[PDB]
A paper describes a structure:
The crystal structures for SENK312A and SENK362A were determined at 2.15 Å and 2.10 Å resolution, respectively, and were consistent with the wild-type protein in terms of octameric structure and packing of secondary structural elements. There were, however, differences in the subunit interface area when compared to the wild-type protein, with the total buried surface area for SENK312A and SENK362A corresponding to 24,230 Å2 and 23,070 Å2, respectively (the corresponding value for wild-type SEN is 24,912 Å2). K362 forms several interactions in the minor interface that may function to stabilize the octamer. Each K362 is within hydrogen-bonding distance of up to four other entities: carbonyl oxygens of T389 and N390 in a nearby loop on the same protomer, and side chains of E359’ and E363’ from the opposing protomer. Although no significant difference is observed in the SENK362A structure in the vicinity of the substitution, this mutation is expected to make the octamer less stable, because both the inter- and intra-protomer interactions are affected. Size-exclusion chromatography in preparation for mass spectrometry showed that while wild-type SEN and SENK312A eluted as a single peak, SENK362A eluted as two peaks. This is consistent with the mass spectrum of SENK362A acquired under conditions where non-covalent interactions are preserved, which demonstrates that there is a mixture of monomer, heptamer and octamer present in the first peak to elute, indicative of a solution state equilibrium between these species.
SEN has been proposed to contribute to the virulence of GAS by serving as a plasmin(ogen) receptor. Although SEN has the ability to bind plasmin(ogen), it also catalyzes the conversion of 2-phosphoglycerate to phosphoenolpyruvate as part of the glycolytic pathway inside the cell. Each subunit is made up of an N-terminal domain (residues 1–143) and a C-terminal domain (residues 144–435).
Residue numbers in the entry: 1 to 433
Write the structure that this text describes.
């Protein structure tokens, strides 16, 4: 009755028009779950591998017919017959079935698709909301969102090194209001960009990549839009964060942060020690609450110095530093590097391992920030994961494009359902600080 009778994958498209897959799970009783998988770029060899077809005549080699076949031909027969509620047993079964460390045989996308589909089918079976199924009875914290409002780095032609600039409505009373604050600042910013004759078309995540003069111009324009929408810049209103993605401009063989990469030949070329100083400059100069990948993915002492210097004032998120991998998170914790981790579900491949990463972080006093990918789908599972774990934060995009807005809407539904029980922690989300 609760027993899984069908597991079926198919090829669909992500928010960038590139193939991905979805899986559907049915129980004998007819309970249904669908899991869609986002795109996963790979950073190193120590991460779940998304399986692509490689046939360059078709979708530029980005097809997923192989992963789909793996679900239908290998995984389905293995998993069919399990109770839909045995999430852990099922995920482990799939890890063993693949038998390789990076889930490269069956594909991390095939495995995750099934993991999510089973969880959602289980919730449907039990007739409870997904966050309840994942987290148990004590789910209640709506996440303070960090919203990608301006893009730099490779996602831009402006002389800015940092990949993302985000706003966080840490001063809002509820998620619903916080979401409105973000939306309003976003519309004010669009208005400001039009006035300056800058481009208001959006990137993968719904933000702008305007031809600013440099990093200071960008930040100051965000501050402009924050004031224009009528909110405070600070802990009582809206604060700012970075995804530096500094690995993208780290010279491995010179061991220095080379800004000329993205900011032209006048740009600074900084040693780790100087990288930490520049970040500190910005933190003193601006209402910065969070900084992601401020150091290089393998610059472990650089991370240690940064954490020593700002770790008590600022959230420091390891994204490529940790790649949702508890082996790396464990070392960060031991070595006092970072105080936050970016959780990308498909960077690891199962919900079970995902939640293990979230718990390891939390128990070390680190925050876990559930994250979108560049290629998204109409799925909003990470909304439920964020609430399920009372994580307190989420990173799921700017305030346009349904590939982002779907998560925000789902969060609205969850808040609405929790009623008086819902909590929004704002600045108190940062228990790592």
């Amino acid at each position: 009755m609760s027993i899984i009778t069908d597991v079926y994958a198919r090829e669909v498209l992500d928010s960038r028009g590139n193939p991905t897959l979805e899986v559907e799970v049915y129980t004998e009783s007819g309970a249904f779950g669908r899991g869609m998988v986002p795109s996963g770029a790979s950073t190193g060899e120590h991460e779940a591998v998304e399986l692509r077809d490689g046939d360059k005549s078709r979708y530029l080699g980005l097809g997923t017919q192989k992963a789909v076949d793996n679900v239908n031909n290998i995984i389905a027969k293995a998993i069919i017959g399990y109770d839909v509620r045995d999430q852990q047993a099922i995920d482990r079964a799939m890890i063993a079935l693949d038998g390789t460390p990076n889930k490269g045989k069956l594909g991390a996308n095939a495995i995750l698709g099934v993991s999510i589909a089973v969880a959602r089918a289980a919730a449907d079976y039990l007739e409870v909301p997904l966050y309840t199924y994942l987290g148990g009875f004590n789910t209640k914290v709506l996440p303070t969102p960090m919203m990608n409002i301006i893009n730099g780095g490779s996602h831009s032609d402006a002389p800015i090194a940092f990949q993302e600039f985000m706003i966080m409505p840490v001063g809002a009373p509820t998620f619903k209001e916080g979401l409105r604050w973000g939306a309003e600042v976003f519309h004010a910013l669009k208005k400001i960009l039009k006035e300056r004759g800058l481009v208001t078309a959006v990137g993968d995540e719904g933000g702008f990549a305007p031809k600013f003069e440099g990093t200071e111009d960008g930040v100051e324009t965000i501050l402009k839009a924050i004031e224009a929408a009528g909110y405070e810049a600070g802990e009582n209103g809206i604060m700012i964060g970075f995804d530096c993605a500094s690995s993208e401009f780290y010279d491995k063989e010179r061991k220095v942060y080379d800004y000329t990469k993205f900011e032209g030949e006048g740009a600074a070329v900084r040693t780790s020690a100087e990288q930490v100083d520049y970040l500190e400059e910005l933190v003193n100069k601006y209402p910065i609450i969070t900084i992601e990948d401020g150091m290089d993915e393998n610059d472990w002492d650089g991370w240690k110095v940064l954490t020593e210097r700002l770790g008590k004032r600022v959230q420091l998120v390891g994204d490529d530093f940790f790649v949702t991998n508890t082996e790396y998170l464990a070392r960060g914790i031991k070595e006092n590097a970072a105080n936050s981790i970016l959780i990308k579900v498909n960077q690891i491949g199962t919900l079970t391992e995902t939640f293990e990463a979230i718990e390891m972080a939390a128990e070390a006093g680190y925050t876990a920030v559930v994250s979108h990918r560049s290629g998204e789908t109409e799925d909003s599972t990470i909304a439920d994961i964020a609430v399920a774990t009372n994580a307190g934060q989420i990173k799921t995009g700017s305030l346009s494009r349904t590939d982002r807005i779907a998560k925000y809407n789902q969060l609205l539904r969850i808040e609405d359902q929790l009623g008086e029980v819902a909590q929004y922690k704002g600045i108190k989300s940062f228990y790592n600080l």
